[PDB]
Enzyme design. Structure first.
Site, PDB file in Angstrom:
ATOM      1  CG  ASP A 138      -1.915   1.262   1.218  1.00 23.58           C
ATOM      2  OD1 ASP A 138      -2.853   1.057   0.627  1.00 23.58           O
ATOM      3  OD2 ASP A 138      -1.575   2.014   1.994  1.00 23.58           O
ATOM      4  CE1 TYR A 140       0.424   7.655   2.740  1.00 22.43           C
ATOM      5  CE2 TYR A 140       0.985   5.327   2.114  1.00 22.43           C
ATOM      6  CZ  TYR A 140      -0.011   6.347   2.655  1.00 22.43           C
ATOM      7  OH  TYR A 140      -1.365   5.785   3.157  1.00 22.43           O
ATOM      8  CE  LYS A 179      -3.990   4.250   0.581  1.00 24.47           C
ATOM      9  NZ  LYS A 179      -2.590   4.448   0.784  1.00 24.47           N
ATOM     10  CG  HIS A 185      -4.961   9.423   0.766  1.00 26.06           C
ATOM     11  ND1 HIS A 185      -3.622   9.384   0.662  1.00 26.06           N
ATOM     12  CD2 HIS A 185      -5.090   8.998   2.182  1.00 26.06           C
ATOM     13  CE1 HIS A 185      -3.026   9.046   1.612  1.00 26.06           C
ATOM     14  NE2 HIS A 185      -3.814   8.685   2.453  1.00 26.06           N
ATOM     15  N   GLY A 237      -2.142  -0.021  15.515  1.00 25.96           N
ATOM     16  CA  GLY A 237      -2.167   1.313  16.575  1.00 25.96           C
ATOM     17  C   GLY A 237      -1.497   2.631  16.046  1.00 25.96           C
ATOM     18  CE  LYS A 241       6.802   2.224   9.525  1.00 28.16           C
ATOM     19  NZ  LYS A 241       7.453   2.465  11.089  1.00 28.16           N
TER      20      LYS A 241
HETATM   21  N1  NAP Z   1      -5.602   5.776   4.096  1.00 30.43           N
HETATM   22  C1  NAP Z   1      -5.213   6.648   5.089  1.00 30.43           C
HETATM   23  O1  NAP Z   1      -5.458   7.744   5.328  1.00 30.43           O
HETATM   24  C2  NAP Z   1      -3.980   5.828   5.682  1.00 30.43           C
HETATM   25  C3  NAP Z   1      -3.641   6.392   7.019  1.00 30.43           C
HETATM   26  C4  NAP Z   1      -2.773   5.731   7.789  1.00 30.43           C
HETATM   27  C5  NAP Z   1      -2.044   4.530   7.334  1.00 30.43           C
HETATM   28  N2  NAP Z   1      -2.199   3.854   6.114  1.00 30.43           N
HETATM   29  C6  NAP Z   1      -1.544   3.073   5.477  1.00 30.43           C
HETATM   30  O2  NAP Z   1      -1.755   1.771   6.528  1.00 30.43           O
HETATM   31  C7  NAP Z   1      -0.225   1.479   6.754  1.00 30.43           C
HETATM   32  C8  NAP Z   1      -0.016   0.857   8.157  1.00 30.43           C
HETATM   33  O3  NAP Z   1      -0.592   1.966   9.000  1.00 30.43           O
HETATM   34  P1  NAP Z   1       0.305   2.900   9.910  1.00 30.43           P
HETATM   35  O4  NAP Z   1       1.326   3.397   9.166  1.00 30.43           O
HETATM   36  O5  NAP Z   1      -0.403   3.744  10.725  1.00 30.43           O
HETATM   37  O6  NAP Z   1       0.926   1.679  10.973  1.00 30.43           O
HETATM   38  P2  NAP Z   1       0.404   0.496  11.761  1.00 30.43           P
HETATM   39  O7  NAP Z   1       0.460  -0.704  10.569  1.00 30.43           O
HETATM   40  O8  NAP Z   1      -0.588   0.687  12.770  1.00 30.43           O
HETATM   41  O9  NAP Z   1       2.118   0.090  12.573  1.00 30.43           O
HETATM   42  C9  NAP Z   1       2.284   0.770  13.667  1.00 30.43           C
HETATM   43  C10 NAP Z   1       3.880   0.579  14.098  1.00 30.43           C
HETATM   44  O10 NAP Z   1       3.780  -0.970  14.424  1.00 30.43           O
HETATM   45  C11 NAP Z   1       5.143  -1.224  14.450  1.00 30.43           C
HETATM   46  N3  NAP Z   1       5.020  -2.714  14.504  1.00 30.43           N
HETATM   47  C12 NAP Z   1       4.916  -3.313  12.994  1.00 30.43           C
HETATM   48  N4  NAP Z   1       4.896  -4.795  13.116  1.00 30.43           N
HETATM   49  C13 NAP Z   1       4.963  -4.829  14.461  1.00 30.43           C
HETATM   50  C14 NAP Z   1       5.272  -5.932  15.609  1.00 30.43           C
HETATM   51  N5  NAP Z   1       5.119  -7.174  14.840  1.00 30.43           N
HETATM   52  N6  NAP Z   1       5.450  -5.881  16.681  1.00 30.43           N
HETATM   53  C15 NAP Z   1       5.657  -4.429  17.232  1.00 30.43           C
HETATM   54  N7  NAP Z   1       5.387  -3.564  16.662  1.00 30.43           N
HETATM   55  C16 NAP Z   1       5.140  -3.549  15.311  1.00 30.43           C
HETATM   56  C17 NAP Z   1       5.755  -0.447  13.405  1.00 30.43           C
HETATM   57  O11 NAP Z   1       6.879   0.113  13.925  1.00 30.43           O
HETATM   58  P3  NAP Z   1       8.438  -0.481  13.151  1.00 30.43           P
HETATM   59  O12 NAP Z   1       8.546   0.214  11.830  1.00 30.43           O
HETATM   60  O13 NAP Z   1       9.647   0.038  14.229  1.00 30.43           O
HETATM   61  O14 NAP Z   1       8.224  -1.993  12.995  1.00 30.43           O
HETATM   62  C18 NAP Z   1       4.747   0.749  13.001  1.00 30.43           C
HETATM   63  O15 NAP Z   1       5.339   1.946  13.050  1.00 30.43           O
HETATM   64  C19 NAP Z   1       0.611   2.942   6.389  1.00 30.43           C
HETATM   65  O16 NAP Z   1       1.653   2.621   6.224  1.00 30.43           O
HETATM   66  C20 NAP Z   1      -0.151   2.946   5.002  1.00 30.43           C
HETATM   67  O17 NAP Z   1       0.094   2.390   3.989  1.00 30.43           O
HETATM   68  C21 NAP Z   1      -3.311   4.643   5.137  1.00 30.43           C
HETATM   69  C1  WDS Z   2       3.889  13.748   5.882  1.00 30.85           C
HETATM   70  C2  WDS Z   2       2.703  14.396   5.266  1.00 30.85           C
HETATM   71  C3  WDS Z   2       1.647  14.760   6.159  1.00 30.85           C
HETATM   72  C4  WDS Z   2       0.548  13.746   6.143  1.00 30.85           C
HETATM   73  C5  WDS Z   2      -0.715  14.414   6.413  1.00 30.85           C
HETATM   74  N1  WDS Z   2      -2.213  14.005   6.394  1.00 30.85           N
HETATM   75  C6  WDS Z   2      -3.164  14.757   6.059  1.00 30.85           C
HETATM   76  S1  WDS Z   2      -2.879  16.503   5.604  1.00 30.85           S
HETATM   77  C7  WDS Z   2      -4.158  16.933   4.608  1.00 30.85           C
HETATM   78  C8  WDS Z   2      -5.189  17.573   5.464  1.00 30.85           C
HETATM   79  C9  WDS Z   2      -5.025  18.492   6.681  1.00 30.85           C
HETATM   80  C10 WDS Z   2      -6.269  18.711   7.418  1.00 30.85           C
HETATM   81  C11 WDS Z   2      -7.551  18.505   6.879  1.00 30.85           C
HETATM   82  C12 WDS Z   2      -7.755  17.582   5.910  1.00 30.85           C
HETATM   83  N2  WDS Z   2      -6.428  16.939   4.929  1.00 30.85           N
HETATM   84  N3  WDS Z   2      -4.427  14.595   6.131  1.00 30.85           N
HETATM   85  C13 WDS Z   2      -4.909  13.297   6.298  1.00 30.85           C
HETATM   86  C14 WDS Z   2      -6.285  12.731   6.204  1.00 30.85           C
HETATM   87  C15 WDS Z   2      -6.573  11.683   6.505  1.00 30.85           C
HETATM   88  C16 WDS Z   2      -8.103  11.476   6.642  1.00 30.85           C
HETATM   89  O1  WDS Z   2      -8.961  11.278   5.858  1.00 30.85           O
HETATM   90  N4  WDS Z   2      -8.626  11.057   8.069  1.00 30.85           N
HETATM   91  C17 WDS Z   2      -7.913  11.565   9.325  1.00 30.85           C
HETATM   92  C18 WDS Z   2      -8.804  11.617  10.128  1.00 30.85           C
HETATM   93  C19 WDS Z   2     -10.405  11.469   9.618  1.00 30.85           C
HETATM   94  C20 WDS Z   2      -9.824  10.978   8.388  1.00 30.85           C
HETATM   95  C21 WDS Z   2      -5.845  10.775   6.792  1.00 30.85           C
HETATM   96  C22 WDS Z   2      -4.156  11.134   7.188  1.00 30.85           C
HETATM   97  C23 WDS Z   2      -4.123  12.303   6.841  1.00 30.85           C
HETATM   98  C24 WDS Z   2      -2.502  12.564   6.879  1.00 30.85           C
HETATM   99  O2  WDS Z   2      -1.673  11.855   7.274  1.00 30.85           O
END
Ligand code: NAP
Ligand code: WDS
Length: 315
Positions: free
Chosen positions: A45, A50, A79, A112, A215, A265
């Site tokens: 993903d 990113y 996205k 996104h 988390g 992640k």
């Molecule tokens: N659509 C959106 O708005 C959105 C928003 C947030 C995330 N995402 C996607 O979802 C992905 C995952 O979510 P996230 O980035 O919030 O992180 P997450 O998957 O909730 O992971 C949180 C932390 O858990 C740690 N971790 C991973 N495996 C572990 C294990 N086996 N034991 C202990 N700790 C562990 C990682 O640290 P380490 O790296 O040090 O292992 C990571 O920083 C993102 O990378 C992105 O691709 C999308």
């Molecule tokens: C390193 C770059 C910074 C990333 C910033 N970022 C931003 S900034 C744009 C922005 C700022 C303020 C308002 C709207 N949009 N908006 C996001 C939006 C969502 C999303 O839809 N959510 C979150 C809670 C409810 C639903 C998820 C993650 C992110 C994120 O990580």
């Protein structure tokens, strides 16, 4: 393995999360995505947000070139960022992501967020005081643009992210709708288990894909440090000891057993390889009931910057 989406394509049910914050050198995404593929991840993903699609796409191309996988074995998502919701900007944004990744198609392109932002190049455009500047776009028009991207073969499937039930309903009741979203990728973990949204999605044959399932990375810009740390939860840790697994594996297995596709992640080689062990064990019904008890409506992304937006999905 995979779940069949509503357009007939297949999504692997464990995906690798590639976002890392700006302090992590860009080159690390190349290394860790190769490690993820080596460990057995086949769903990857990314996003324009990113600042890593070139590195991720190179890792995918490297693992194809060295014979490890074929392109059809990899499910790659990117996205559409929120400054590109105006319909005329959707195809150029997807083309730009394909160019960066050096791929001919993405398996999945998502809106996104529903939180439209001022059109432009600035990722989070801000005024004088520093207030991010919002836009008002009918997302059904953005959706029609996504549908044309699927017709053109630039995305095998299309879906959304961060939508609530009402915003999904708006798309699903669109006059002349051609394709439903395949999925809605949203924050989802045992402190915010989204059971009402999951039920709505299952009733529409839409897959719920959980992000921040471990988390979240607890980024200072949007995370309250007082918020309980999901993997330190005593019920998750007691279940980890019961199964001789780890709290992260309990949290990922919980999702698979509810019919949720789960992202994870990690930029650490050992944790990447650990996380694929979610397919090696099962939780019992009593275990799942214990984890359902943790729900506390806690979304880690919790900032005034998001909450003031007119299409903020949480309420
Ligand atoms: N659509 C959106 O708005 C959105 C928003 C947030 C995330 N995402 C996607 O979802 C992905 C995952 O979510 P996230 O980035 O919030 O992180 P997450 O998957 O909730 O992971 C949180 C932390 O858990 C740690 N971790 C991973 N495996 C572990 C294990 N086996 N034991 C202990 N700790 C562990 C990682 O640290 P380490 O790296 O040090 O292992 C990571 O920083 C993102 O990378 C992105 O691709 C999308
Ligand atoms: C390193 C770059 C910074 C990333 C910033 N970022 C931003 S900034 C744009 C922005 C700022 C303020 C308002 C709207 N949009 N908006 C996001 C939006 C969502 C999303 O839809 N959510 C979150 C809670 C409810 C639903 C998820 C993650 C992110 C994120 O990580």
């Amino acid at each position: 393995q995979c779940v069949k989406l509503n357009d007939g394509h297949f999504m692997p049910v464990l995906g690798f999360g590639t976002y890392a914050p700006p302090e992590v050198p860009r080159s690390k995404a190349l290394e860790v995505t190769k490690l993820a593929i080596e460990a057995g991840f086949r769903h990857i993903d990314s996003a324009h947000l990113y600042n890593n699609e070139e590195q991720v796409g190179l890792a995918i191309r490297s693992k194809i070139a060295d014979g490890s996988v074929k392109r059809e074995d990899i499910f790659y998502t990117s996205k559409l960022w929120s400054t590109f919701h105006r319909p005329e900007l959707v195809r150029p944004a997807l083309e730009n992501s394909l160019k960066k990744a050096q791929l001919d198609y993405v398996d999945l392109y998502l809106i996104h967020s529903p939180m439209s932002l001022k059109p432009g190049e600035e990722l989070s455009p801000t005024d004088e005081n520093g207030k991010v500047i919002f836009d008002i776009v009918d997302l059904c028009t953005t959706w029609e643009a996504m549908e044309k991207c699927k017709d053109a073969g630039l995305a095998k499937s299309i879906g959304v992210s961060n939508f609530n039930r009402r915003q999904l309903e708006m798309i699903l009741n669109k006059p002349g709708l051609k394709y439903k979203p395949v999925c809605n990728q949203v924050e989802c973990h045992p402190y915010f288990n989204r059971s009402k949204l999951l039920d709505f999605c299952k009733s529409k044959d839409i897959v719920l894909v959980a992000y921040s399932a471990l988390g979240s990375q607890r980024d200072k810009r949007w995370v309250d440090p007082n918020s309980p740390v999901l993997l330190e939860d005593p019920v998750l840790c007691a279940l980890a000891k019961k199964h001789k697994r780890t709290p992260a594996l309990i949290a990922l297995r919980y999702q698979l057993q509810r019919g949720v596709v789960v992202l994870a992640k990690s930029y650490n080689e050992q944790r990447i390889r650990q996380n694929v062990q979610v397919f090696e064990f099962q939780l019992t019904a009593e275990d799942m009931k214990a984890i359902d008890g943790l729900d506390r409506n806690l979304h880690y992304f919790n900032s005034d910057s998001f909450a003031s937006h007119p299409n903020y999905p949480y309420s």
